[PDB]
Design a protein around this ligand. Sequence first.
Ligand code: NA
Length: 241
Amino acid sequence: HMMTDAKAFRRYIFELYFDPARLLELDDDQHLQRIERFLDALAPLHPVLENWYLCGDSLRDALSHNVTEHRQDLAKALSRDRRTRAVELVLWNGEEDPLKGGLSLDYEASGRAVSSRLQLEDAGSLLQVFDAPASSFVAIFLAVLEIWPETTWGMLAPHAYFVHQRTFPDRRSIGWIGFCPHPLRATDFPAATELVDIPGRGTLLLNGREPMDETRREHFERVGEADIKLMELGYLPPLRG
Ligand code: NA
């Protein structure tokens, strides 16, 4: 079918991974500059992405420091979020309700893979508000690739799919939309899969969303067949790493 199931909210995972050695080379000024550029790139995509704030305890405190208004506040996020062995930065977009596009951002750079990453949670909130979600999510990937040439993997996937349906237990997944840092040939992939070639970076892959009804071939062809081809190419990275 062309439509999805009818559900009030779907949890998603949205994670971009960076080469830890190359990311660690950056100093704080460069991390802050990249985050500033990334927030700038989010702003045109939807009204809920236009404002970002430091976290706080009272609602008044958590809305007092708009880092898209006062960019010096971004350093104050780094100051309270930093830890001895890693830069970390946490922001929220000022919307408390996930059903209204509420979102937080978590950026870490440690020199290790697990904590050299950009996460948007819960990205299912953006599926709530995007009029044309496929292209808007691709635009978020495109921003990350332009700002972080160190990107080594990206995945946007339903949480339940990743946890309970990913083909390879000890590997990452390309998800519904994802980034693989290699050129790919449409020949090797299903017809429902769209490949966006990004010279100098790799490929963005768009599989189809989960429909209300689908056959066994269609089920296999969705995210599973793409993960299988990536694994067969040696491009699907291990989870532990
Ligand atoms: Na203020």
